[PDB]
Amino acid sequence: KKRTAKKNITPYQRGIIRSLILTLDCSEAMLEKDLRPNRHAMIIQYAIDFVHEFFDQNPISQMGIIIMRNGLAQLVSQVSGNPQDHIDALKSIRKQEPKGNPSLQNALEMARGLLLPVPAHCTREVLIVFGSLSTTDPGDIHQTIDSLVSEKIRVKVLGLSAQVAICKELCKATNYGDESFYKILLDETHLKELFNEAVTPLPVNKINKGFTLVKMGFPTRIFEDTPTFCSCHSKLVYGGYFCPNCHSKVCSLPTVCPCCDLMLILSTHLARSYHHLMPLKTFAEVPTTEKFRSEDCFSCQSRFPXXXXXXXXXXXXXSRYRCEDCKQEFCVDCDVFIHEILHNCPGCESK
Amino acid sequence: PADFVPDSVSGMFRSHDFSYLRLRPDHASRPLWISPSDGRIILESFSPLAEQAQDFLVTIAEPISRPSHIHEYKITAYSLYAAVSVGLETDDIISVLDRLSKVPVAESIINFIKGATISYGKVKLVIKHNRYFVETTQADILQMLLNDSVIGPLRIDSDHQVQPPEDVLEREEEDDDIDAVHSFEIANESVEVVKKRCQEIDYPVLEEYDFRNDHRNPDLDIDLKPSTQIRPYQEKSLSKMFGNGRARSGIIVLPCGAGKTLVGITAACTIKKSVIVLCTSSVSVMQWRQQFLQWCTLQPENCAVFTSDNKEMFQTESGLVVSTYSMVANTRNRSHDSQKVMDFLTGREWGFIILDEVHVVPAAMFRRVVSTIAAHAKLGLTATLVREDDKIGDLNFLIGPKLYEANWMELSQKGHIANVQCAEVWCPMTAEFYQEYLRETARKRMLLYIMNPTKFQACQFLIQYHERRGDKIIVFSDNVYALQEYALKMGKPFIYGSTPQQERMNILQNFQYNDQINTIFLSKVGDTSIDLPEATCLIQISSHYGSRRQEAQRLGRILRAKRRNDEGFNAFFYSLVSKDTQEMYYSTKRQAFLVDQGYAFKVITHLHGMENIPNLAYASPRERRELLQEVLLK
Amino acid sequence: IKPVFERFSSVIITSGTISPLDMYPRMLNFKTVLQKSYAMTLAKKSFLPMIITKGSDQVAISSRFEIRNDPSIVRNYGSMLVEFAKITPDGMVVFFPSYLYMESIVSMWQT
Numbered sequence A: 001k002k003r004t005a006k007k008n009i010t011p012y013q014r015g016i017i018r019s020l021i022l023t024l025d026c027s028e029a030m031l032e033k034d035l036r037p038n039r040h041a042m043i044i045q046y047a048i049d050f051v052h053e054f055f056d057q058n059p060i061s062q063m064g065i066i067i068m069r070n071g072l073a074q075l076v077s078q079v080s081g082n083p084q085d086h087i088d089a090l091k092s093i094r095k096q097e098p099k100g101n102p103s104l105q106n107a108l109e110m111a112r113g114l115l116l117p118v119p120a121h122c123t124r125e126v127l128i129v130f131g132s133l134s135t136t137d138p139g140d141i142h143q144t145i146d147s148l149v150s151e152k153i154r155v156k157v158l159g160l161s162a163q164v165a166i167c168k169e170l171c172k173a174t175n176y177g178d179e180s181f182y183k184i185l186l187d188e189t190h191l192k193e194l195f196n197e198a199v200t201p202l203p204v205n206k207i208n209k210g211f212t213l214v215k216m217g218f219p220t221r222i223f224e225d226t227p228t229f230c231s232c233h234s235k236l237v238y239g240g241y242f243c244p245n246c247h248s249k250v251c252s253l254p255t256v257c258p259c260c261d262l263m264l265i266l267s268t269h270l271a272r273s274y275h276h277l278m279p280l281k282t283f284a285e286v287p288t289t290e291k292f293r294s295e296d297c298f299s300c301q302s303r304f305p306x307x308x309x310x311x312x313x314x315x316x317x318x319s320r321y322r323c324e325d326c327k328q329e330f331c332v333d334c335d336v337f338i339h340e341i342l343h344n345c346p347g348c349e350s351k
Numbered sequence B: 001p002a003d004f005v006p007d008s009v010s011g012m013f014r015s016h017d018f019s020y021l022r023l024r025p026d027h028a029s030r031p032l033w034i035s036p037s038d039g040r041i042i043l044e045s046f047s048p049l050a051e052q053a054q055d056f057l058v059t060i061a062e063p064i065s066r067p068s069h070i071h072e073y074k075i076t077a078y079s080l081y082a083a084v085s086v087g088l089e090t091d092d093i094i095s096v097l098d099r100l101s102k103v104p105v106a107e108s109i110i111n112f113i114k115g116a117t118i119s120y121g122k123v124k125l126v127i128k129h130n131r132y133f134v135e136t137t138q139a140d141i142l143q144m145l146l147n148d149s150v151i152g153p154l155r156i157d158s159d160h161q162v163q164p165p166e167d168v169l170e171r172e173e174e175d176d177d178i179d180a181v182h183s184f185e186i187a188n189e190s191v192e193v194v195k196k197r198c199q200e201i202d203y204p205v206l207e208e209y210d211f212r213n214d215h216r217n218p219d220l221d222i223d224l225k226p227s228t229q230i231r232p233y234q235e236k237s238l239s240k241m242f243g244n245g246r247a248r249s250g251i252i253v254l255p256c257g258a259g260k261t262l263v264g265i266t267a268a269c270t271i272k273k274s275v276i277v278l279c280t281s282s283v284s285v286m287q288w289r290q291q292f293l294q295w296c297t298l299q300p301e302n303c304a305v306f307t308s309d310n311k312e313m314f315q316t317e318s319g320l321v322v323s324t325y326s327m328v329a330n331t332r333n334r335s336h337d338s339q340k341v342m343d344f345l346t347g348r349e350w351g352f353i354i355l356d357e358v359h360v361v362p363a364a365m366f367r368r369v370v371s372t373i374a375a376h377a378k379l380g381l382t383a384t385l386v387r388e389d390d391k392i393g394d395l396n397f398l399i400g401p402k403l404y405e406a407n408w409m410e411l412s413q414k415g416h417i418a419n420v421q422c423a424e425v426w427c428p429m430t431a432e433f434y435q436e437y438l439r440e441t442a443r444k445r446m447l448l449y450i451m452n453p454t455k456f457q458a459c460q461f462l463i464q465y466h467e468r469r470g471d472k473i474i475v476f477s478d479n480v481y482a483l484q485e486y487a488l489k490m491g492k493p494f495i496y497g498s499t500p501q502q503e504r505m506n507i508l509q510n511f512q513y514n515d516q517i518n519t520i521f522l523s524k525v526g527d528t529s530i531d532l533p534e535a536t537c538l539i540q541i542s543s544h545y546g547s548r549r550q551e552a553q554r555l556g557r558i559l560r561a562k563r564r565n566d567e568g569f570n571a572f573f574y575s576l577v578s579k580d581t582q583e584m585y586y587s588t589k590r591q592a593f594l595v596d597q598g599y600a601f602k603v604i605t606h607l608h609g610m611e612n613i614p615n616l617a618y619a620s621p622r623e624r625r626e627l628l629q630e631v632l633l634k
Numbered sequence C: 001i002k003p004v005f006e007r008f009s010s011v012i013i014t015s016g017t018i019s020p021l022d023m024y025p026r027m028l029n030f031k032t033v034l035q036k037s038y039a040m041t042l043a044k045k046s047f048l049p050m051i052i053t054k055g056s057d058q059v060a061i062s063s064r065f066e067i068r069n070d071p072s073i074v075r076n077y078g079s080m081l082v083e084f085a086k087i088t089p090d091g092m093v094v095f096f097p098s099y100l101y102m103e104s105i106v107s108m109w110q111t
């Protein structure tokens, strides 16, 4: 009675430097009382969460937002590295209400040309939030399907608690013909995890492609406050940074330089990918009796592990999630939180 | 003996003893908390079975409250008859929820529940020839039938009838008790004496309505067309009485002002056979047939109205009858145009009878109408569940089982009357009003405190609010001059006491068809009996309103239904009552009964622009003194 | 079938619809060897057989009443049908008992 992936085929190329513009539906379909306020308002509530988390888990990526109203698609946020512009946009969109019907193809092409300026290293991907059962297409979608795949842009979409075969085909078509990207929801928490699994990069098996090196520099913080003066926005900045090359007083931003146009990053964003890059194997729950290890947690101090021949209480299980590489145990609360937040296996860290 | 003994089981068994009594140990493993000795059922958020529970408890018992965490319970011995109308597995209700109910169930309540549920339900009622017949659910029914004298006066000694059993069924016995026993035919006049003894002898019987036994072989064609209207709570509550396809004449306390006629024109035309529609009085019924039926399917030329003074199409109406209780069976049938109608009502089959707020009238006139006609079905669209024709033999069981009661939150919230709003505006009093409160000491000040112009000011916003919000306005004010003293103030084509119709017909063709006119009103003559028009905003003023049975009638009726969910409160209500007055008690007593039955009651004494609205005519307290020389004279 | 019965012994007949497998031996007056039906070995439902005797009105609804229209049954059917169009995905077919009956219901539903 366990719901776990048999193995995690992460080990190599994933989607790290990302250029995702998720597309929403703003139609009468999103207006209906499927979720407690409705689809859209709860979704807008739900959608807000991922934005910062996307920028949290993937600060090395850029993102804009497009919606679809009354049989027409409408971009609503610029592709940027700052959540706030995207964040503040949804607040109006929260106070805005979905209307009419969505135009899939309008979103198809508006986003398609939107991703044209994206560089090769920045990985192009799109995700869709759809509620209806039909589209509004000014032309041959399969042509656009052909156009997108010719652009080599894999895509995952998540419709509502239903299936669309072409959308099932589209996620298939976008993703090298591999259909694992039309997963749909059945519950709000089951919807919540969709956000939770979305922040992850996307390794399956990347074809041997041109791999590009990157050159940039770190920024240097400005100290004075009374000297308030800004260049990237022509403002007065009571504290900022300096480009490694153009050497411009720049406000706090891990984004690209505005003068010689180079990426400015200190350290934090880099190691975020690292634990993503090489994660650990799950701490294996050691057996109730075949383990016979120390009656305590390893990461934490959880002296209770079972119940010791207590009829079924001990025959239930043994909170003995043991990392295999370290051969050291961990309490489930510790072990799950470890794999949840910080891989950093102390048993493997200690050597 | 003839007093209403079996009707009032609801709300019983409310007691407990701390020091002496004991507690059901199951509370710890007890998701729910039902108290039989206390009469309530506290199924809070811990009680998750409110879906089935509300389905079962609503039928079995009464809802004490509607808390967000969980509603409340009322000991519904009448709900025992209501649960008797359900008939599901009895143990599951006591047992399946009993696990949730941590404390044990009430034993005396259980003994009462045994008496209430099936105890008063097995006397005798045989079925004869596609109708009720001379038999019994129990042999005592036959033995009492063997002793039947008043019942025996009008029965066919044949076990049943084909044409008589179709017609005589000595009247419609299609509401007879437990069948599957040998019967004897029932004649074609007078089951009144059959049910006369049952009032005094108390035959406690399990009944039903054999709906298809209302064959009514001659089908007097009706217009089953979508000209008439319907909203979803009907096709639930109607479906409650419709049953599974085969429409059963059931008992439905239907407020006139809930799509009442909408129920009928669906139902009646559904029978597509000879129907009788019936309202109070020849003058009163006239308004009733008028203002809904022609946008609806009905045309006046066929729904004939008699008085014995209005010689109309009796024995010749190609259409059905809309009738007047006054005309039908009363001493003042002092001529013959009404007389031959019954002769025709005996002469012609009748598959449907419509009853409207007959709680106004004693059954003396009413049971007179039912003593010869020999119909097939009836329908009492009741106004108040406590009435003067609901004796031990209730009208709740002559048409059919219970199917509709005071639960609009489950029913009316289907978009039919969704987002039901009740508000009690407490207008602060002024010196002159209170000096009037100081002045006299009688119920004539009912005229001298209804006169509040700030109440008009608050209502004037509601006018302008629903001038713009697109909500339908109803103002309940039986006044005449003060209405005109405010009809001049408010400024729309005015409906007044003793209005000639066509202007109101223009005013209501400015209500169903036009929008430049944005207000209407009700007096003591329109009500009654006008078919209450579209409603998204109600204003009510009178609160003494003899009787409370009329008030419990007045509650759901003055606020009509609305196929609406767009408005945040698809039926606004406003009880404009000047605070610190006599009717404050009455309006608050109304306010409790506003919140007693589930109507979403509230209070807004801080109106949205109470004074900001224009035409503040007579606003100044000296102005409130200037004209006060008039109202005191009332 | 008798000459084709006569000409050969090895003959194979199959169907996913044939029920019961005994009328046809009665009908075509022949003896088979194995009269057996196979069941779908599915660990999942994959199809919901639904008998709508009662509509939203809970009316026993039928096509045997007439070859004509009665909105009590028909408009109930029309109201019943439309809710599927919203929820169902691409792919939904109806099967009338008769083409003339098919057209009969079409025009008024169009109306």
Ligand SMILES: [Zn+2]
Pocket: A230, A231, A232, A233, A234, A235, A237, A250, A251
């Ligand atoms: Zn700046």
Ligand SMILES: [Zn+2]
Pocket: A243, A244, A245, A246, A247, A248, A257, A258, A259, A260, A261, A262
């Ligand atoms: Zn620079």
Ligand SMILES: [Zn+2]
Pocket: A297, A298, A299, A300, A301, A302, A330, A331, A332, A333, A334, A335
């Ligand atoms: Zn631990």
Ligand SMILES: [Zn+2]
Pocket: A323, A324, A325, A326, A327, A328, A345, A346, A347, A348
């Ligand atoms: Zn480890």
